[PDB]
Design a binder for this molecule. Structure first.
Ligand SMILES: [Ca+2]
Lengths: 360, 362
């Protein structure tokens, strides 16, 4: 009976990924060990390193990019941000908190504004970059927004960052494995991805980085990940992450079409009600995320309504606030976020609950 | 394939495995307000209580906080970085996750050990008496990962309290093997790690006194009361909790079993000449045997062991700081046991040892 429509918060482990993780669960896995068990573990994580590379359109033997395994997408975002505290940082107004909250710590960080549809103001970006006097610069702009699904024109942004010789990072967490991504083509120096949001289970994630930039570690010790990130590698999670990346990439088209049809179905139904606003309705979005506002309702209350109907959705909001949405309306938002495993029946169940919870 | 390298990592306990698998079809984000999220939150709070019990404390006492980290290394980095702005004192035999802060912390001093690996308490006092900063951290590994040597943490704690220093111990190789009561020991802080006790990788924790505010290394969504952001690794935490409870409930039976294997192994090793058991004559863990064999190269001998399908390892700042010369230090072999090891594993090790080192009992 429980209907899960909150896939942007996390999703379940893909059955094929599950089977693979289980097959490895009786083993001792320390990649730093010189013996046969250790070498087996090391080979697993290097196989994953190549799987992630392939998924992002890059070739590791080219030694143009490095891949550093982190415990989480949050960790990877912190790692790249802290590497530029000694320079000028520029971030979109709609970053995930793992980038955004560095406003409270970084010595020189500026927020690039967005318009009322959530798109980065490229003129404001140029202005900010032109005013900077430090040669070490980082621009960080979320490809696909976790609240609204709004997509930024990363390739265009990258032309601007290259013009001012800024390094360019994008948080890819909500885009990876849903829409095609070629890091080199986009002109990114850095990128963050996370395993649990793509069905690889928790504990696996990565920061991808240009090889002509030396990342300084946050976490020191045994020298894992070429001394960029110490601690015994989470081999099972890394293994899951790799397999989920390869599966999502190989089936990206079939999954895209399936999810997109559910979204079109859901959104055609929602527009039969008054007072429902789809956030970023007029600009490119992910095929899986529908964020709505419903003025003069309190999302905290309505979410309890959903949970009592056995439906898992969520709310958000700095994102809506920075888009120019008023406080009351911002506290009314509901996010429905889909997976390729969702069905037409899930959507219908959501709609029947919606009508009851909103009395319409 | 005989595995005798349990200090580097160990396999997931079969009960822990079954429990992790039972949860693997779920969506688990403790920050989500709905029923799936609340279920995930409940799992991690349950684990928090399981860890507290295993460390001889009650969370409801509100004397300690427990912060889940991805690894023991992460927990060690978090506490160390919290004292970069004060004076830090560490043993000469710390795990690299504490030791390598020598290369970063603005004011860090190394407390020496004697030739058996015991911290020089007189040197500790001297160092603490010389400090002019009120914010001080003493960090001393309870149970050493190379040699198994145990420090007298309770005594050290009296000295730290005399100079009003905070006291952290890396418990990673002691937790779930010997009884530990962090309050009784006088510890402000402690680090533990799930994979080393059969909970699988990805779960670990820094335990901290509730009258000290830890400042975060990793910011974002405010998980773990804003001490450590990032979506919690619920499955690993769950495994960690169950392994902690199992180890703590069976700590006597496991201790006896492991101790007998060690006594068996060490009686056998001492029938060969020029095999030296490191810290033979001071208190050690029941599971770890570190030996030096002068005029051999451990890197070469380990190829021998691998060819005999035996997983062991080598040591070495630890041996160097104990006064062992470079040649002898490069000869060390570590045999580290689990309650899952058998008499047969020991016999197989010894049969390989006799071939690899060309000796019979004399
Ligand atoms: Ca001979």
């Amino acid at each position: 009976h429980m209907i899960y429509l909150d896939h942007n918060a996390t999703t379940f482990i893909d059955p094929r990924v599950k089977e693979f993780i289980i097959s490895l669960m009786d083993k001792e896995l320390n990649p730093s060990s010189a013996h046969s068990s250790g070498r087996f573990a090391k080979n697993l994580i290097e196989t994953v390193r190549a799987q992630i590379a392939t998924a992002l359109g890059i070739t590791l033997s080219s030694r143009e990019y490095d891949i550093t395994f982190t415990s989480s997408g949050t960790e990877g975002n912190n790692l790249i941000m802290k590497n530029f505290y000694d320079g000028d940082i520029f971030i979109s107004a709609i970053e995930h908190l793992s980038i955004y909250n560095h406003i409270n710590y970084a010595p020189n960080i500026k927020v690039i504004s967005v318009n009322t549809q959530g798109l980065v103001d490229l003129e404001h970006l140029e202005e900010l970059l032109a005013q900077s006097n430090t040669s070490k610069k980082l621009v960080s702009i979320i490809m696909a927004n976790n609240e609204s699904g709004v997509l930024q024109d990363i390739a265009e942004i990258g032309k601007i960052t290259k013009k001012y010789e800024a390094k360019f990072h994008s948080d890819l967490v909500q885009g990876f494995g849903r829409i095609p991504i070629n890091i080199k083509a986009l002109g990114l120096d850095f990128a963050t991805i996370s395993g649990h949001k793509i069905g690889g289970g928790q504990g696996g994630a990565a920061l991808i980085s240009s090889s002509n930039f030396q990342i300084t570690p946050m976490i020191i010790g045994g020298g894992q990940e070429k001394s960029v990130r110490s601690g015994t590698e989470n081999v099972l999670a890394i293994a899951g992450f790799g397999l989920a990346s390869a599966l999502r990439t190989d089936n990206i088209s079939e999954n895209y079409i399936k999810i997109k049809k559910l979204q079109e179905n859901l959104e055609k139904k929602l527009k039969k009600y008054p007072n429902v606003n789809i956030v970023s309705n007029n600009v490119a979005r992910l095929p899986n995320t529908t964020l709505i506002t419903i003025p003069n309702t309190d999302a905290q209350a309505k979410l309890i309504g959903f949970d009592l109907h056995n439906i898992c959705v969520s709310s958000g909001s700095h994102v809506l606030t920075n888009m120019g949405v008023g406080e009351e309306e911002a506290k009314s938002s509901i996010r429905i976020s889909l997976s390729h495993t969702n069905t037409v029946r899930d959507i219908e169940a959501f709609i029947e609950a919606f009508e009851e919870i909103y009395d319409v």
